[model samples]
Target: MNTPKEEFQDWPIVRIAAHLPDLIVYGHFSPERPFMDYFDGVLMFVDISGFTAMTEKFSSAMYMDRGAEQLVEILNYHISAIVEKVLIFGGDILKFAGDALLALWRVERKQLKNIITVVIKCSLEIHGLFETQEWEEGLDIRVKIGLAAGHISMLVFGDETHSHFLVIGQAVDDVRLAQNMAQMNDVILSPNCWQLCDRSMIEIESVPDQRAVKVNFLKPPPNFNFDEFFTKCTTFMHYYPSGEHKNLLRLACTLKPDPELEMSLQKYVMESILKQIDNKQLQGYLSELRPVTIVFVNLMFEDQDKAEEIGPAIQDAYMHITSVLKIFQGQINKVFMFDKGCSFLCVFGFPGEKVPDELTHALECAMDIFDFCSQVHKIQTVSIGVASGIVFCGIVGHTVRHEYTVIGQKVNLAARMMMYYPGIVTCDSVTYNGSNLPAYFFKELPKKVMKGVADSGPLYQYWGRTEK
Candidate 1:
């Protein structure tokens, strides 16, 4: 439904960048064509230390009226700054994981030595920007950066009907592990990165076997000029559409974005995002903290290998689930790929404004998803988690590459429950009590110890609808 052939032909080429990584747009990708991959580079994962709690704090205070606007401005400022630096150093943001960002720098074997230094220097630059900047009067911010060098995989997930760009490989894992190992306001480097990076350029605090802490800040190459490189990179990534508006990239976006413009980008963004932009008539930082039901569907493949069969199997299930979710108005937020298969998040009240029985709608949604899973053989079991509570729903990342996603305690709780049991919809008590579906019978499951909750508070399970 998102990317139909011939339909997207009329879409402005520049706006399409919102759907995938800017790097892909820079390369000018085509729907029917193959994309080049395995570019040797350093993949960087930068995490904002206290952004969530801060977003929550701001959400509660002004709730996007006044107090929250400051938070949005602060976030946009920092992220926009980081994006400029990344672009200047020949890198592009792959995607944004809520407050954290995944960026990459492609290099030929020729500049392996030099690019490594610059990548490391780029990390220091990212760290220093947050460290020195006075974001808000009291709201302090810090960033943790992890750099790993390897062959970057430009893997795309999904079928011809729809697909999203993803970067996967050892480097994906390397940067992930390295970032988790990082402390506040510090940059960590992977062994692969450390080996190739110019040792003289960067100074390390301590080599802790696997990863190294970078306390010493380094300078970029002498010839580096932000404005000059910035102009060149803009040209490098400029989308030269073949037509009368070939020079449109050079023109400023003077007119207010057409309301229809945001809707066309709907498949690439959340439905709520379209609504927010539609209502406000401008996009800055649109967010709200409201009670909503969150559902997570985890599909485990029996045979882990074999994309030929696995891809189509997933496509089949996704189409069926899409129809099912449509019945209850559940918005499928994002799709996540894994070693076994994939899982995705669906929010009922997000774009919904929530039904009178959103919790029940989510339960019915889970049961229908499980019913479909029973028929598929390549799929071992379909696991789902449902929870209802207040969540922070807002736009994450900068304007160039951002997605509307919800984050909060309940969101994390639902994820844990999805992995808890197989072939069942595991849910928290909040969902259990809030459910109003008369056809469903819920059994109280054993306690599940969550992050903050002491002793799993009244967890429950739904075997199936109890029909008369």
Candidate 2:
């Protein structure tokens, strides 16, 4: 029997303890069943109004390839920045449509007024992020947001290897429909959301049909002069004891600062002020649901006994793969050893360092690992699968053992694809279509339904790299 110290060190409990403060206080940790109950909450949708026109313009550019690359980079930057705002305001993102994002927040009865007020504030802030910032030349970016509050249903889908959280209901649809009715750079609130909002902070007017209301953010707080604060406040100010500084930071926390204003007042200065007030809300361990690309690598050895004999080669391969992942800012999510060989799972596009080309990064890492392994031992072949989608990333398990990993269908699909093709890289349609790697050719495979995948689409095999 192992001693307590040895067993404690072996258990993956470090991450759990690190975030215990958030998890315990929020009461979000539940190991028995997955998914949340039907809850009352607010749903919001923010759509980039002129994305199609911008895309068309970029597509017609003389250097089409470069234009496409730039478009992806721009979209990535906007989406990631918006997501940060969503989390900062205590909301959860459900999915990213072509040029829009869907997010929702569960409303606690005690904080109902505060919740709706923040959502209203956040919607306007989201629109301001684009209006006040300079995007690529000739590309006009505008956002329209719609907000609704009502009963919403949350569901968990997937199998033992993975799971996903999905929020669905009439409220979700209502907010999306309301978003469609919004004009450029407008924040439209559904009657339900408007009914719950704190009017003192938000001013609004009803639409002609009374179906939606055009909401506007209130000006800087009472007796506060924006010009004076910019000129007079010299010392690094932290606490918002009273007056305009407190109201300014309170409103600023709901959305990203405008670039023009950023230069005048300094972006970090506003962020530091927000941080002082924002950090107090957490209760226990922390977990966030977001979009990520999952890469799974499976090694096939000729014989089980041979794998053990050549263990040093496996360790070397693991080390090389890990080093390459580190260079690309990838996270090693998990490692499992099977009777034949070991499996390694990696994640890209994590919080604080989300990259626009996560799929491309995953494919590149897969190719490098394949090359390294092929050179190390001819008898051992590598297979890799890449998938992208929303995942629940957090610490889970009882007090005995726990780990920080993501659960989603994308993870399961990646594993399934690796099993389907034992010696090559395979990717689902999402990964194949989203990636813009010039060196690789994706040969379409006949569509087949894989286990645990519902009505899955076509798969792509990474045929070979083209000589540049």
Candidate 3:
């Protein structure tokens, strides 16, 4: 109001509006200046190894009266049971990729060895899912798991309807690669993962073609403390209960020497309550203006009108590109598919989080995408544009269908540059100069007038990383 505006220049609302771009973009606030950590953990992936084979056989068989819907129900029931084990062991279930789910266990400095041991034990028990469990119609569930320990980057992805916590790192890839080498009911460990465990606890089997080894749990180490194990299990159950604590309670009852201690563990498990979380509150709308690096990838095809015709190829390209983004901790903001081609917008430096080397990571990811697509020998050529600046990121639109997106001049500039230069990787001066990437990695280009901007700015072409 005019009266309030005149009465106080330092009003709380006025100050809040001054810093908030949501109001400044609409002219209610004063202009502002733009401004801009890692998690070390064990990453694990567990997947039903023969799920595809099982599904294929079911579909082809005439005796299998269970329809596709029934098959889905059966599959979900098993996956839910498996995930319960993950939670009971204090692992954070990141996301489900097809028949597998990726999870992370952040190790604490105080109990690093103990936590790692617990993870290994929990993994072995999870294998018990396939141990003599009877299934209706002979539908068996066998899973392969991979474990690796290293540094990781995480980002929160979702809207009001759904929420997903995603982790990205070299460790994530290592686990996947390890899983590919795993046999039925096998627990494969990366080199780093194997190093963390006590040698006496595991027996490593050499693989024929791969560098990693298959890990088989031998026995608990001589120094293993049942009391401490029970305490950790209790703490984990107290926080993330999913009815699997009963298993721990049963195990404790057998091992625990004291009747009082056994009873206490049973009491804790019986009384443990899984905190009910409000979905809307947990996944509420978020809005902020933050410094971020935007990468726009465009797939160019010769036939513009029939772009969507290459269904399988386009789908493959999307999957590969998305996987690359996830590897670099890039959050995909949007994917627009047209008749002729498709575009993916990936945002780094997401709101409410700090990602180390965000600009450099985005640049490397864009180059990787180009390299991966080029080697595939597909019909479409990939082009990428990178720009770094302040961006407006928020959950916008009506409640029925809201989405998380990045909006601002930087996003538009990145898209326009990608449009201007197809079959090449380009970046605005802001990204080229702001990142720590060496000069030889990119070739400087003449300044060009960018749309919607008054002045011309520098641009560069990525030449790939140089030899040290």
Candidate 4:
């Protein structure tokens, strides 16, 4: 077969649908026509407890052997159930952050009463699922459901090369607060949800000062329109053009060949995820706790408003960063864009490839990133934070959209180190001690406790590569 100059267009519908959100798949999303919309919706945050222990156990027990297909299989069991449940009620699985998920249920003015009921029963079902089931020996699986209702702003935040499907509003933050406040098997409602939901429908209790309350699970609200709700919602739902189908389940094929569409959806997926897909080892792509080095690179732009003016320059910076990460055998986990600038989360020692001195390589990657950003024309300051330890590292998100990321305190530690220091490379004690590099390469920072993370000890700054 001859190598074609252009991308192949006739790929399977499942392949495209698997990597994108509902908005992109069904709404004719393309690069030429960027999409964003506002909706009055209910957002739910499902936080999994007892997952860290499961990841840790599986990582340690299987590191010397093969991948954690069983752990991921069980993890997907819970994740899939939530995703499937959301679709059943005509909602979208927004995005996954670490062990928790943020799902959205669009609401109309007259239909809000019905929508909130749908949200309540959906949250209860997800909450009660863990009560009787167990994932593995010695580990109990559970979730905290945080539900909020309000006007939601759903937007795609990124430039020409990358796009992030995000839902932003007071409702988003309130759900997070509710989720954090929730305790074992409780479906907590945000202040907004508490205000709007019918009082008699749920048996609830408030969490002191905040209006966020827990929804005690027993059964659906009395005379709930189970059949009617699904019928109306399915009719209003978006799907492939060919089907009069009620929901998004009908896999529709795009008749016209468009590589541009393929590229748009493919850009959000990370390199490692694509590799697993190409290799047919997609089972190895699920979440698990593993020892890895996380490097958080923050590119600070002096002016925020001129970012679009310097879009090409930003793309250049991204190219340089990805190039540097590749040379050091690092995996580009995800890139986050902000008002000031963007940050790249780079990982070393992801499963399948074991580098003997991954900790040292992380330091080298940071130094290289710092050196590159320092010479860039627009960047005001560059911060490199390296942290090494156990992390729940794998693909998170459902069939609609997924991203490879690390979820752990070490990730927090690294990002904090980046925030606290600028124009240099900083790392936690674990990363510093694990490296085989000479002592003079690093200068120890004064001991300071990170607020929520476990006491990890002193931070270290890698001054230069002179000790090599």
Q: Which candidate is the best by lDDT?
A: 4
The residue-by-residue lDDT of candidate 4 on 1-468, one tens digit each, is: 888664433354345456655655555553531245667878787886457666556656555644355555667678777777766666666556555666776757556555777778877777667777776665678887888888765555445665555455567767777877887788888888888877766677768887788876434567876777556755545442224433444243332446766666666666456556666666555556678889998887764434233444455566677677768888666655443546677888776656778888889878988888778877788898899987777665555445555777777778777877777799888888888888899898876655445676789899886755
Cα displacement (angstroms), candidate 2, residue 336, comes to 32
The 10-residue segment of model 4 with minimum total lDDT is 246-255
Residue 33's lDDT in candidate 3: 12
Off by over 4 Å in 2: 1-36, 56-61, 132-135, 217-468
> How does each model score on lDDT?
0.63, 0.58, 0.57, 0.68
Each model's TM-score?
A: 0.74, 0.42, 0.44, 0.74
Q: Give the Cα-based TM-score of candidate 3 against the true structure.
A: 0.44
Q: Number of clashes in every candidate structure?
A: 0, 9, 0, 0
lDDT of 2 at 73: 52
Tens digit per residue, CA lDDT, model 1, 87-203: 556566776654477777666655656666666767777777876565557656778888888766564443343444555555666676677678777788876677777776566
lDDT string for model 3 (226-338, tens) is 55875664553323433543433112112223443222222111010101011223332234456788898887665432322333354556566767766777766665433
How well does candidate 1 score on lDDT at residue 115?
62
Query: Given candidate 1, what's the lDDT at residue 320?
Result: 72
Candidate 3 ranges beyond 4 A from true positions: 1-37, 54-66, 133-139, 156-165, 230-468
- Model 2 Cα lDDT, one tens digit per residue, 258-312: 4433232221121222232245334222344557888888876665433234444
